[PDB]
Symmetry: C2
Subunit: 498 residues, 2 copies
Amino acid sequence: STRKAVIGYYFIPTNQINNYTETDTSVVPFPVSNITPAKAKQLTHINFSFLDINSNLECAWDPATNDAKARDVVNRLTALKAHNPSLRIMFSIGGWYYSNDLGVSHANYVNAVKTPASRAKFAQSCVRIMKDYGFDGVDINWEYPQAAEVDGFIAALQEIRTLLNQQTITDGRQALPYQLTIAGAGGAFFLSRYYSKLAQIVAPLDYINLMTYDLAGPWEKVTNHQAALFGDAAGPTFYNALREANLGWSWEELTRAFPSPFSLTVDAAVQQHLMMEGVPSAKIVMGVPFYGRAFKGVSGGNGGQYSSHSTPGEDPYPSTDYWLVGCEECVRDKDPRIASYRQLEQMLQGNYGYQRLWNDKTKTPYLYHAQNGLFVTYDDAESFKYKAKYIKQQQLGGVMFWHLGQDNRNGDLLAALDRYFNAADYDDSQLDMGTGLRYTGVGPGNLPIMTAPAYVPGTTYAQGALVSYQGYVWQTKWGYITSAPGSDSAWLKVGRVA
Amino acid sequence: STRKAVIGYYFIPTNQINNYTETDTSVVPFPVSNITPAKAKQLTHINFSFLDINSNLECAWDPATNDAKARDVVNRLTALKAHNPSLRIMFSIGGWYYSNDLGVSHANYVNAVKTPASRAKFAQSCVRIMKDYGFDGVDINWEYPQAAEVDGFIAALQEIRTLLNQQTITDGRQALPYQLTIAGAGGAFFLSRYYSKLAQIVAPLDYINLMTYDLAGPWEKVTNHQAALFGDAAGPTFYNALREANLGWSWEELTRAFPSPFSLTVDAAVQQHLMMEGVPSAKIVMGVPFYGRAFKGVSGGNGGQYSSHSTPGEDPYPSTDYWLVGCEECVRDKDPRIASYRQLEQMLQGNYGYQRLWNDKTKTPYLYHAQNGLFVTYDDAESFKYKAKYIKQQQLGGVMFWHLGQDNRNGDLLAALDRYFNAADYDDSQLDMGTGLRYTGVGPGNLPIMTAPAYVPGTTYAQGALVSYQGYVWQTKWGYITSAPGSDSAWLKVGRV
């Protein structure tokens, strides 16, 4: 079957670009030189992060960036294409810092998508930046547009798509056409902002990269896995925000589509996308984290899972106290609540008191430090076996990860993902996916095929009766029904007619 | 202090109009002469019923009607205006028999409201019939337009209103304008057909007369009160069909407005109407029944209430077994499942074995026949004290009842309703409304008054936070909210400033 995408974000802060060096990890912890030809072949896309949208409403680099240094970092990434003729170096506009509701550039995203004129100017600028610096496509990473801004956002993506397609013909790039993707919400609260129009949002895209991580963190009162594949009934459950999206569905429809409370998992985000009509599985890309999130003040009994904790949830980390034992990266970056997999692996080999445990429902690992009362949720090569099998089974487009610079020095996590999809000597045919909780919502745009007698006008139906009419199977919600199916409150669409 | 409307239907079948007499109750049980001047003064409206919509898609009398006789009957009703200058003799078009989905004339209602041309033609015919026969207004009783037919129905009511207001000016009736009313569903199931557009339906009307009765009957498996004011937790509950109406509301909005299951009561229907914006309490009229519904084969334990039964639900009554002991009218009308208050009163005092009991949650009476296993749900002057106080407390337009011919010969039910609203020596200040279940849904039309600090752009809000914005009070459904009420679905409008 078609090769699965392996999309790795490459994030480098402005100060690191300005002082870019490949010989001092205290200045640039993960230079591009860490990506060898072998690693370049394991990737299909690298999303350079991040560019922004300025007050002139055009795509642009942070003005503090030294432009020559930026071109040089980008060149090192585009030079990797020499080793992999399928590789694309995309650039991502946005990210949380720039584009969140209270972000430094949020107004620019909202204003840029407002009118046909602003959208054209903004789209033209994305193509100009892509060609000027040598990128191969555009990833929009606005976190996140909401209700009133969605139509503009959709029109902007359509315009960018139109310009990129023309550029591909102009540049004779049919063999490796310019692409357009977005980073999408991987949890129902943020997803509810634009869920109703998902089909229109995904249509112009090669892929929608779901941010299926950060599903747990110090900002929540109960410790949990931040990227559980499936649910654990013993873990916390959440309000299903999609029930509040402007969908126009009935109470029964909303309830059947959006069980609540539910387990906030990777499988839930993926299935919520597939429930919508017009959202093809092949465009859905599952994101995975190359970092873990840590909590302190946890109780014993369940390895630190599902415990109250004493971890501040705000940003920036408000204290000078670095309590994640062995995490020297946390000290350098001034936050003991997050650590790259590279660092977590070193902690696990440093005999610091951590026990690596495994939850076989969620199919994810976690660290527990009994002596100090610490819990860390993270992902590794083992949880990726299950996530890679899920991507194959669900016919998803591939995997995305945040971020490359957090893999260990040998690039084991990236190598594992590539191995699970492509290695002749890896066989997951017997991998047991477990009995973790699956998301089982059904939407009016993903009904199962059902069979029932054609509706008969003039007939009075009892409660629970099933009939086929105008392409669907309908069920009555009460009795003495003398009206036909369709619009009328008494009938509920429950299946599709073959 | 606006006088409460007292709207009584006057129903007379075609065969009775054709053989009309005021001196032989075996032929016409309730002639117009039974409406004495004292009774005429106690009514504000009499809804003459029923006319229909014919194949020409125009308002018209049943074609079997002797017209000269019909005019004589109507003239007798309008002559009553000599005794009460506020009285209106309305005529009602429809009713269940003619207009239900499977009724003989249903297609005519559906077709009459379809186009601008058919609506204009139908509307003109209503005013023509009104003027020709001397009626004072039009009451539409289509039971009931379905979702797809509602926009047509609304347009038809608007056209009739336009023509009536024109006619009022042309006839110098500013002191007693021609009126337009409809008989509205009094239960959520039928109400769900047009509930989403209630404001538009009610705008052209003087009143929407809720048929808040027949909420129990032989078609239901469990015996129950047919017009409980409030709910009894021991009784049956029902699926709230309104949560499936095409409202476009969110899950939280639907759930808060439509608890399910719920108690199918008079209060439920009234509150359901008040939950919609644009439905003024003053236009809502509570219907009450002047008849009871009977069930056979009931068990003991709760006086016949909430029991299984063996009563056929089909129409016409599918048997010749008249089992309602003492009900002579039932034999005459060939159906032991329904009895006028007049007949029930006689049964109760005739030593036929009925015990009158009272449910103090529903505030309604019922009869139980222990020997034969019978249950009868009905209303009387006592249940009417609670319903009239409710009408006053809720600032409703008044009361409507089906039908005049079922009151006793002294007119006690009508006199009771009039007393409760207008007697200077009647005092219900101490009348306790009880602990029966109230319908507690909240919708756009009945948000509670609240106060909250003004929403502040830039501020992040936790779950449960309350703020004022755009004239309403809002509450967050989850945490870390960063945009504004009306622009972020995390906010639920819970109050009115």
